């Protein structure tokens, strides 16, 4: 064989180039940096109204409003300052595992297993909420829809492919193929031009939403990737697998900076987020809890202990003022 | 210290919360019957003969069923099955006609899951007009030599059923249900009604501690 040898040696020698120019682990440099201590965080509010397992939760663009999706087929927009239910959206298919809040507060798009990423419009002339455009064309379950603009949305699915859609026209402008398993999480970059997705084949690949070109590819886990999010500066992203490991990749080093697993941890991660300063790596674990990982020392500097069921979604306000956490107990709590 | 608007805002919040409460109350009124099965297992036959993800909503004898066919999902990665916890009872489907070994393995995998550990299973093998015609060609040794009983459709089917249920690694908490009658007659639905009735009754008495 000729091309097989070329591919094998290509992988091996670019890996060797990565290794030779690799200086040292980050802990080797930031070891002398003092820790943060214990972030003992208190439940201020308690959002009750959902009567089914909570799955996904996205913060508002103004750090005030919230969106929450449950198995009761209800997407509910809340006010975090008064625990008031601003809107209540009855969905069609209750198998909803992901949905997010438009950066302009105009639209909320939310769907799931039924392979359609529906889009809802709030600031209507009639005072109610209607579905603007339902994005159909996938053949597998969706995950981590994300709004780029009011007419540009990024969606992953179980078809091993993420599709950039055009909300006005209703067609898939671009397709991002290259995964060998269900792509169950993606996060938009802060600049809204790059996005990283994690797939069930234990690898995450940084993708360009503009030319549909697979820029980077990442490995290091042993099982599927369960959550993915960007560092606030859009230069790194962390992932959480069923290996009970949270891993941080740098888009330029092309290598895993640090894992954030602890021996006592038995089960895998289900969601991950970041603090506004990017100092507190938050991660929702399966047992009952959320864990507050200092992203530089990988030490559990505080535990959010509620949620008599498994945590399924986290979120940190654009200003870092709060932390909303959701679990299958159908109760979201804001911790500060 | 509520402004003039904020009182109306709280009124609307209470209205929405009441609507959510009643919607969830209705959500707890309906039966959730997850349906699985390997290829050409007859799930299409089941759905057509009876009264991505596909939801089939029908009612029977004043009870409402919501059976969810996850067969459409082309990814056998089981990253969605855990959302189906709490279903009243699942429906494994298979037909007598080395596919049987794959069905055995799938049944074992479904039984041994942590998430269905306390969720009874309901197995249907309804089509009966052809299950017995093809037996004359050969016994259950085309790929299952262990069989040693007489090559008849009364004993062969019973042995297959026993081998399937033998995959039940924990009967203390969980039970198994089976059906064999011909699919043509309208008795498949009644068995679904009986099994759901019994499993809900056992869930009730289970809650009380009476069990």
């Amino acid at each position, epitope marked *: 064989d000729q091309l097989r040898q070329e591919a094998e040696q290509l992988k091996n020698q670019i890996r060797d180039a990565r290794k030779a120019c690799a200086d040292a682990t980050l802990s080797q440099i930031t070891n002398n940096i003092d820790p943060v201590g214990r972030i003992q965080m208190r439940t201020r509010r308690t959002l009750r109204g959902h009567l089914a397992k909570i799955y996904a939760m996205h913060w508002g663009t103004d750090s*005030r*409003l919230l969106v929450s999706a449950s198995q009761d087929g209800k997407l509910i927009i809340w*006010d975090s300052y008064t625990t*008031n239910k*601003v*809107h209540a959206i009855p969905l069609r298919s209750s198998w909803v595992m992901t949905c997010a809040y438009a950066p302009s507060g105009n639209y909320v798009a939310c769907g799931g297993l039924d392979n359609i990423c529906s889009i809802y419009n709030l600031k209507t*002339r*009639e*005072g*109610n909420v209607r579905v603007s455009r339902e994005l159909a064309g996938h053949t597998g379950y969706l995950s981590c829809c994300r709004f780029l603009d009011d007419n540009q949305i990024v969606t992953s699915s179980g078809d091993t492919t993420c599709a950039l859609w055009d909300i006005e026209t209703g067609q898939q402008t671009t397709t991002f193929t290259g995964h060998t398993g269900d792509v169950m999480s993606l996060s938009l970059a802060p600049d809204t031009r790059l996005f990283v997705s994690g797939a069930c084949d234990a690898s995450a690949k940084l993708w360009d939403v503009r030319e549909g070109m697979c820029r980077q590819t990442f490995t290091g886990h042993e099982s599927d990737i369960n959550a993915i999010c960007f560092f606030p500066n859009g230069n790194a992203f962390a992932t959480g697998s069923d290996d009970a490991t949270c891993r941080l990749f740098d888009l330029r080093a092309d290598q895993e900076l640090m894992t954030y697993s602890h021996d006592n941890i038995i089960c895998g991660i289900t969601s991950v987020s970041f603090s506004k300063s990017g100092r507190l790596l938050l991660a929702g674990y399966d047992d009952f809890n959320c864990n507050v990982w200092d992203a530089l020392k990988a030490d559990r500097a505080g535990v959010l202990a509620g949620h008599d069921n498994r945590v399924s979604c986290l979120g940190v306000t654009d200003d870092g003022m709060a932390v909303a956490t959701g679990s299958w107990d159908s109760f979201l709590k804001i911790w500060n | *210290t509520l*402004s*003039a*608007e*904020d*009182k*109306a*805002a709280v*009124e*609307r919040s209470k*209205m929405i919360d009441r609507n959510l409460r009643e919607d969830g109350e209705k959500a707890a009124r309906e039966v959730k019957l997850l349906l699985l099965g390997a290829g050409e297992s007859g799930k299409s036959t089941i759905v057509k003969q009876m009264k991505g993800i596909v939801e089939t909503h029908f009612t029977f004898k004043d009870l409402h069923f919501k059976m969810f066919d996850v067969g459409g999902q082309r990814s056998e990665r089981k990253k969605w099955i855990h959302c189906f916890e709490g279903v009243t009872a699942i429906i494994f489907c298979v037909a007598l006609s080395n596919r049987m070994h794959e069905s055995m393995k799938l049944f074992d995998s479904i039984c041994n899951n942590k998430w269905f550990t306390d969720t009874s299973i309901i197995l249907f093998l309804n089509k009966k007009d052809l299950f017995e015609e093809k037996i004359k060609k050969s016994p259950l040794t085309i790929c299952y030599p262990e069989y040693a009983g007489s090559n008849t459709y009364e004993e062969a089917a019973a042995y297959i059923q026993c081998q399937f249920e033998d995959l039940n690694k924990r009967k203390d908490t969980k039970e198994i249900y089976t059906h064999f009658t011909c699919a043509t007659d309208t008795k498949n639905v009644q068995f679904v009604f009986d099994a759901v009735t019994d499993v809900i009754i056992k869930n009730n008495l289970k809650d009380c501690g009476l069990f």
Partner: single-chain antibody
Amino acid sequence: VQLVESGGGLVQPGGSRKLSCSASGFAFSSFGMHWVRQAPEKGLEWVAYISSGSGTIYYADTVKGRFTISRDDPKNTLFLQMTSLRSEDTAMYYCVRSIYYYGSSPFDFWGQGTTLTVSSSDIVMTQATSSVPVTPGESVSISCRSSKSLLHSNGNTYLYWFLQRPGQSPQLLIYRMSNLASGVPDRFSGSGSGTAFTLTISRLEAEDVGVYYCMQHLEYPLTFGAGTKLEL
């Protein structure tokens, strides 16, 4: 969105008339409904208010206990039934819808209105003048003063700016202090603090003429201003 009333006409004192507000073009069953009157060539004056779902009801102290408010959500019809009428009820009755949630404009759409004719503590809003001549292309500033400081502890400053073009019903411009309305040109702007509130209109055009007003929320009853009228 189309709010049209009926039941207007002439009635002798001591009788009981009834006013209907048929609504068509929005989700009436979620929109707080007010009633506002405009006595002839004097100005706007609040009457009543019914919240969503017939929960909370208020009245103006002038006619408190004499007017009644009915609401039919499944038919989208709002009634205002009057019992006894003196020589002051004669006015132009409008029908105004409202939604109160975080960030809403609850006084956006004003009904076409129905005229009524009858044969023969509270916050005070003071409007500086009643007539101001000006030509197109000139920046105009209007202002009205307040009794109490409208700045609630929330940070909100509940003041409303409308505009009544001649022969037409009012129209909202700024719904708390500087938050433009739905579909109003981005020309209108407002500012102020505590008790002095002003509306600035730069690059004035011909269709900007009419009687201005400043209405104040933050307590019931809702008291309008006297009303400045731009002239040209």
